[PDB]
Ligand binder design. Sequence first.
Ligand SMILES: Cc1cc2nc3c(=O)[nH]c(=O)nc-3n(C[C@H](O)[C@H](O)[C@H](O)COP(=O)(O)OP(=O)(O)OC[C@H]3O[C@@H](n4cnc5c(N)ncnc54)[C@H](O)[C@@H]3O)c2cc1C
Ligand SMILES: Cc1ncc(C[n+]2c([C@@](C)(O)OO)sc(CCOP(=O)(O)OP(=O)(O)O)c2C)c(N)n1
Ligand SMILES: COc1cc(C)nc(NC(=O)NS(=O)(=O)c2ccccc2OCCCl)n1
Ligand SMILES: [Mg+2]
Length: 582
Amino acid sequence: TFISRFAPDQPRKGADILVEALERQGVETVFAYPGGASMEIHQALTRSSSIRNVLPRHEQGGVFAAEGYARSSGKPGICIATSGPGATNLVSGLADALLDSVPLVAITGQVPRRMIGTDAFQETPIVEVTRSITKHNYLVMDVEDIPRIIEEAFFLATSGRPGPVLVDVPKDIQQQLAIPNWEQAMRLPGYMSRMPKPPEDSHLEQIVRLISESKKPVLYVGGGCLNSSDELGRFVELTGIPVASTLMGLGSYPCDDELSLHMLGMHGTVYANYAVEHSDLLLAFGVRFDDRVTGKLEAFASRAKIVHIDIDSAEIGKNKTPHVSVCGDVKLALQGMNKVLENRAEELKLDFGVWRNELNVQKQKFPLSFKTFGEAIPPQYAIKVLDELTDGKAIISTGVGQHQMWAAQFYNYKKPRQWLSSGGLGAMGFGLPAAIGASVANPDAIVVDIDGDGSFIMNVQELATIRVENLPVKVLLLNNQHLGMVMQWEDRFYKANRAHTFLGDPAQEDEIFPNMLLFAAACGIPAARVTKKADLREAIQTMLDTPGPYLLDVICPHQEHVLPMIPSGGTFNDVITEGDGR
Ligand SMILES: Cc1cc2nc3c(=O)[nH]c(=O)nc-3n(C[C@H](O)[C@H](O)[C@H](O)COP(=O)(O)OP(=O)(O)OC[C@H]3O[C@@H](n4cnc5c(N)ncnc54)[C@H](O)[C@@H]3O)c2cc1C
Ligand SMILES: Cc1ncc(C[n+]2c([C@@](C)(O)OO)sc(CCOP(=O)(O)OP(=O)(O)O)c2C)c(N)n1
Ligand SMILES: COc1cc(C)nc(NC(=O)NS(=O)(=O)c2ccccc2OCCCl)n1
Ligand SMILES: [Mg+2]
């Protein structure tokens, strides 16, 4: 039974109704940056004794923090911004949450209703701007609609395929007195009638039937399985099918497990891409067949019977036409299939040891490899050390680029929601703010931001947020003085012709620029730099043992290349396995 701070017959400001609507949704943390159009909301937040606000230093940091909060907990992330420039700064985060299907509720202030359309002070049609980069949005036109719209916003953001929902609130609605009706019914008749039903038994029996008839099955696991780690692990026990995971699905099935094929796709392991290439049964659970995974669609699983389970019917058959399809929650599909596999276990006699041995040969002939040049620190090795010293229990957020791939390749994530990374949009500057949101959602957890020097500086202002909020955020900064991923493509396809990919100072060309240690020093964050591989282990240990925030500047040779690499739109026979920028 919820307890209000107001009487059931007492009028209150619309902003106070909005905050209570968040309290009734179980919201404990918001990321709000104040402004003229949202000042009433911020006043109402201070009257709440249960909602904590983490003030960022940039609204993009606010929405990215809301993402990390959501990605690391399953709860919806809530960020608030003012109208105009505050709202437009949320754009990259909204598009990022939509492409990666992250539950998020963004609240933006707006000019009063009578001013909409007049090009008023700090007015942008944020609903028109964000309509194509949000799951849904609203423009509240009456204070009495606040309880209903907030309930619909959280329902849409978290149900079905999760996504971002934006609620635009005019300032006059925030100031108007009203008595909220919390028993309003939601006006989502179409969306609720099309919600996927629990999977039929006839569909699940035919999938188990296809498993016993297959000799080379491969699990194709993605972000849709982040809530099915137990059901998926039970499914792999009953079948013994090797598991190939996407960038978004890392952690659903443990990386250090005997049956793990690790990541597949453009930068996936050779054996994972080999397994999908020569498979006859592809179990696509919670994936969307991204071009970064498939390459040339006609050659992707060209001789496999494809079973696609997805909660979004618009995804089934979008890029790759499956033989069998199940539109529903993969968590329930795994539960129903696990029941069938237990009863008919001895009847089925499932054994893929010949297929597993064929893959284990590829796993030992073509494993993930990296060179060690003198005393220079290999970035892959630094992430390996961080894995050991944290026992693989840390929450990892990354930016975008070479460091992002190495953090996916060389860290053994044991559970889902340890891996917070922008995969669909691939937005730089995601790492640091996402670590902020993950730390607030998991206060007793090890949170490390494996960032690149280009991505880290984009939202470097959030170092102030880390210090003020006293968050134990660790920053493992893999510094190669370059936009490394674009540099790698320059080496491969443009004769190593540098086109504005160097991030240092050409005048002092051999100096580490910028001095990231002084960025942390400006925000009272202890920091250190390591250059030689011998000192790396003690440096990372110092970062972990030092209470509170810490920044570790890890200098890496820039000529490293992420390997292996299937060129964009290529096939498995086009995979690149050797070479760098030397
Ligand atoms: C530089 C860079 C390189 C990259 N290279 C690679 C790469 O080599 N390999 C790679 O895998 N990725 C790579 N990506 C990431 C990438 O572009 C995509 O994000 C990823 O490939 C697609 O993830 P996904 O297939 O799991 O679908 P997601 O984006 O995770 O979406 C989840 C899917 O499952 C469905 N779903 C959601 N919930 C449920 C549920 N409860 N039940 C059933 N279904 C559900 C959704 O409808 C959706 O179709 C790279 C990204 C970057 C930035
Ligand atoms: C807001 C934004 N702007 C430009 C981007 C285009 N990209 C990249 C990519 C892969 O998305 O291109 O497809 S990666 C990248 C450079 C990465 O700099 P780093 O942080 O130092 O990482 P590293 O360890 O050195 O490689 C750029 C410029 C991007 N994604 N986001
Ligand atoms: C790690 O991914 C990266 C990283 C970097 C730095 N640069 C590229 N370069 C291309 O991606 N070139 S592209 O094939 O024309 C292309 C561009 C944009 C979207 C899709 C696409 O593929 C379409 C063919 Cl299916 N890829
Ligand atoms: Mg870099």
